[PDB]
Design a protein around this ligand. Structure first.
Ligand code: G2P
Ligand code: GTP
Lengths: 430, 434
């Protein structure tokens, strides 16, 4: 439980993870070559959790990039921090499933699982103690979702003793109107719920609508969505990147947050909302950000926590926080809205402090809460699957690989049972 | 002669151990290297400290933990040479706020080294007396590893007394929401092995530091300094040549009248912050009256509902027996204190003429005289009622039970733990009626 290894898959996942590591190096004072260039010693206090010490005090990401389309390779070396990742971690295919889960999970999956398992073992026995595994991938994309699901299955059957976090990207019709999105999304979320411990549902629908309504981005490209996902996924990982008494490890995250094995998807929250093109935002006060968490726009799930009820919530504060005022404010917020907090889980509201603020701003706070409110996200995925499935269309691509529709039926059944679990846990009371 | 060994399980245990050992070496004129500055030639401190040929006095304590952060923080801290490397134990796998992981999955591969260290420490201890345990209820390690170690030590030694200074979790300084499970499970497991345990409610101590010390936020450091002061006040009679010497066996005899009721409530006075340029010294009667309000104990409970099975006083400072007896007589006039008819009289006298030192840099202020009130009352029944009410609300929906299930143990263990706590509460209300 000492070192985290990052697993990267899919063009969306590859881009978001690459520029996320860019941001992490920027806020840890790591140059584009790998040498430390910060000022405070807090940056290097637990730098080994993500980076690996190299020759000449160089630091190298423990990120393994996989993608069948080689365009992401040029894209990842095109931007900054392109050369920090070692070439052996750039194990890429050639074919490209192209929005087909089965094509990227059966045909070319076997040709890549061997190499990726070999390399991940290389750093696993090259690391003092493995915290677990984290995955950044897109559920809609056939290549990325298939490769990520195969990696999840192989690592789960190979490392059952280690936690497996996943930063899944839920497809949205607005960002991309691919027809086969619901099928791959449902199969991938089934594979997730079978073999994951923490899952952050980074749905692009919420990203697009909050970019349009708040950041005034008429056509938010991949850059803006990647900016928001990097911000939120750095905010959540502040727990693992800096010393703190709350959420030290992935196992501590699982113990504190998820009460049930089949209920482990997460709602990523973080305030304020800063765009790439704007940097002169004022310093928001603690009350503003504490009451900013309830807003659905500030929530990075296409959701509404008013509909659901909070099971467990984790909050970390970054800046020159008045810590006593922080505790009083969070206690008052919990008291004022006790209806949405499960009364059968006492003291489920937790707060944390981080001295180092994200670069660019000073006032920030993340809201990683586990609530049943994503029940409506699963409603939307279910209605998409049914509306694209009640005519029994588009199944011929999948049946061409030899697999039948029985997997689709069982995945839908398990997802519906998961929705029923959400409803039952929401309606439960003392 | 009557040597004792202190065990510090978990992060909370090792930190409170560091603080208390710092205070001990300050009080007994023990400079950090371990040598005696013009003081080698009282022999009471030899029970807690082992003297080598070189003249340094390494404490007879062990530091065990399943994460390597606090352990090598102590190693790299101000006391590199104070503790030898063998009584420092690390681990690459932590329980991570899980009693099951710290008891079955991860505890088993470290308890062997722990027993080896304990045996090595006790080898030079001729008159072995008892074991001191410091840990946390809320923490997964401080519960599971503590329980497993207690079972192993009961298997090995047995009749030797065992004392626990266990951290009682509080929401203000809580780290995990699954803490009631761990606390209930560990106190159920160690109930038949802990001859006497001292419950320290972190909410009460948090409030004490907030109000008495006038601190905006009681951090972990101030809390640890205060609790180390409390533990030192409790164990000074064992570490000093007091007139009415009380040892661990006498602790069991006095503060534990019933074998299943072994949670004495401590109350030490006074607590004056370092500022104000004056401590405003309180008289013996004043400090005696200051140890009875419901805002000074170590556990947030009302003693009025409780009944005194046994109460003891330990004056430690510039006190005279005449004023001590006068204060005791004045206190006895109060009807707010009542003793069970089975007990003859819940009162005891402990006098330590040595002045009580204060750790340098601490927010506490030097006081000429002080006293800690140790009583076994059914006021702790309210705290236990809060704890098992949280447990009952927590277990009604099988929340987080699967984490415990995955580590071997099942819901059955929760069942006998809950019924054992229920039986403990009926024991409280049985002894609470005369
Ligand atoms: N939030 C983001 N969503 C993205 C991004 N790129 C794509 N997507 C969304 O993910 C979906 C596309 O899935 P992918 O890009 O992962 C296709 P995949 O990588 O699996 O195969 P290839 O790209 O052909 O190599 C679609 O809904 C897109 O709108 C991105 O940079 N950010
Ligand atoms: N009084 C006091 N309590 C503490 C201290 N440190 C931790 N605690 C309590 O201990 C609880 C958590 O246990 P941990 O400190 O994590 O100890 P642990 O059981 O070894 O768990 P890990 O350190 O994660 O392995 C917290 O909820 C605190 O209330 C301390 O220094 N003083």
């Amino acid at each position: 439980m000492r070192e985290i290894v990052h697993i990267q898959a899919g063009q969306c996942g590859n881009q978001i993870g690459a520029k996320f590591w860019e941001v992490i190096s920027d806020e840890h004072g790591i140059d584009p070559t790998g040498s430390y260039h910060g000022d405070s010693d807090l940056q290097l206090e637990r730098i080994n959790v993500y980076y690996n010490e190299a020759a000449g005090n160089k630091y190298v990401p423990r990120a393994i990039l996989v993608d069948l389309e080689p365009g992401t390779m040029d894209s990842v070396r095109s931007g900054p921090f392109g050369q920090i990742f070692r070439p052996d971690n750039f194990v890429f295919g050639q074919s490209g499933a192209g929005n087909n889960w089965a094509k990227g999970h059966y045909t070319e999956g076997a040709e890549l699982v061997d190499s990726v398992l070999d390399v991940v073992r290389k750093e696993s026995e090259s690391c003092d103690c493995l915290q677990g595994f984290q995955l950044t991938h897109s559920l809609g994309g056939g290549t990325g979702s298939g490769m990520g699901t195969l990696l999840i299955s192989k690592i789960r059957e190979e490392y059952p003793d280690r936690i497996m976090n996943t930063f899944s990207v839920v497809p949205s019709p607005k960002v991309s109107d691919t027809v086969v999105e619901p099928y791959n999304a449902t199969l991938s979320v089934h594979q997730l719920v079978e073999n994951t411990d923490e899952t952050y549902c980074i749905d692009n629908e919420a990203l697009y609508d909050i970019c349009f309504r708040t950041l005034k981005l008429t056509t938010p490209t991949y850059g803006d969505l990647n900016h928001l996902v990097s911000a939120t996924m750095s905010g959540v990982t502040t727990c693992l990147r800096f010393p703190g008494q709350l959420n030290a490890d992935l196992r501590k995250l699982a113990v504190n947050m998820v009460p049930f094995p089949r209920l482990h998807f997460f709602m990523p929250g973080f305030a304020p909302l800063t765009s790439r093109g704007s940097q002169q935002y004022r310093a928001l006060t603690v009350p503003e950000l504490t009451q900013q968490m309830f807003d659905a726009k500030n929530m990075m799930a296409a959701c509404d926590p008013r509909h659901g009820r909070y099971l467990t919530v984790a909050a970390v504060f970054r800046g020159r926080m008045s810590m006593k005022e922080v505790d009083e404010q969070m206690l008052n917020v919990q008291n004022k809205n006790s209806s949405y907090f499960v009364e059968w889980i006492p003291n489920n509201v937790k707060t944390a402090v981080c001295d180092i603020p994200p670069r660019g701003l000073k006032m920030s706070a993340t809201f990683i809460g586990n609530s049943t409110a994503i029940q409506e996200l699963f409603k939307r995925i279910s209605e998409q699957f049914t509306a694209m499935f009640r005519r029994k269309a588009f199944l011929h691509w999948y049946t061409g690989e030899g697999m039948d529709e029985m997997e689709f039926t069982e995945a839908e059944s398990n997802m519906n049972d998961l929705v029923s679990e959400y409803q039952q846990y929401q309606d439960a009371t003392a | 002669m009557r040597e004792c060994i202190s065990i510090h399980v978990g992060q909370a245990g090792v930190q409170i151990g560091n603080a208390c050992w710092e205070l001990y070496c300050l009080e007994h004129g023990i400079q950090p290297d371990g040598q005696m500055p013009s003081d080698k030639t009282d022999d009471s401190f030899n029970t807690f400290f082992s003297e080598t040929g070189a003249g340094k006095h390494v404490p007879r304590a062990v530091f065990v933990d399943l994460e390597p952060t606090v352990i090598d923080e102590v190693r790299t801290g101000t006391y590199r040479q104070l503790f030898h490397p063998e009584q420092l134990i690390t681990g690459k796998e932590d329980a991570a706020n899980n009693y099951a992981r710290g008891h079955y999955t991860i505890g088993k591969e470290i308890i062997d080294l722990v027993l080896d260290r304990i045996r090595k420490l006790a080898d030079q201890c001729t008159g072995l007396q008892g074991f001191l345990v410091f840990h946390s209820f809320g923490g997964g390690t401080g519960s599971g590893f503590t329980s497993l170690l207690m079972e192993r030590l009961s298997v090995d030694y047995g009749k030797k007394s065992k004392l626990e200074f266990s951290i009682y979790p509080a929401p203000q300084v809580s780290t995990a929401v699954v803490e009631p499970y761990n606390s209930i499970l560990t106190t159920h497991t160690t109930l038949e092995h802990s001859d006497c345990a001292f419950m320290v409610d972190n909410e009460a101590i948090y409030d004490i530091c907030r109000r008495n010390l006038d601190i905006e936020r009681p951090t972990y450091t101030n809390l640890n300094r205060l609790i180390s002061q409390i533990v030192s006040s409790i164990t000074a009679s064992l570490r000093f040549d007091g007139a009415l010497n009380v040892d661990l066996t006498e602790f069991q005899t006095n503060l534990v009248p019933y074998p299943r009721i072994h949670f004495p409530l401590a109350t030490y006075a006074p607590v004056i912050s370092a500022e104000k340029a004056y401590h405003e010294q309180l008289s013996v009667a004043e400090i005696t009256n200051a140890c009875f309000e419901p805002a000074n104990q170590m556990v947030k409970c009302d003693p009025r509902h409780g009944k005194y099975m046994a109460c003891c006083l330990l004056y430690r400072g510039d006190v005279v027996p005449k004023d001590v007896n006068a204060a005791i007589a004045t206190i006895k006039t109060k009807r707010s204190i009542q003793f069970v008819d089975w007990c003859p009289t819940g009162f005891k006298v402990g006098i330590n003429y040595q002045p009580p030192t204060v750790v340098p840099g601490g927010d506490l202020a030097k006081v000429q005289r002080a006293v800690c009130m140790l009583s076994n009352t059914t006021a702790i029944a309210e705290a236990w009622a809060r704890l098992d009410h949280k447990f009952d609300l927590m277990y009604a929906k099988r929340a987080f039970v699967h984490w415990y299930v995955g580590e071997g143990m099942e819901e059955g263990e929760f069942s006998e733990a809950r019924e054992d706590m229920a039986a403990l509460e009926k024991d409280y209300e049985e002894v609470g009626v005369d």
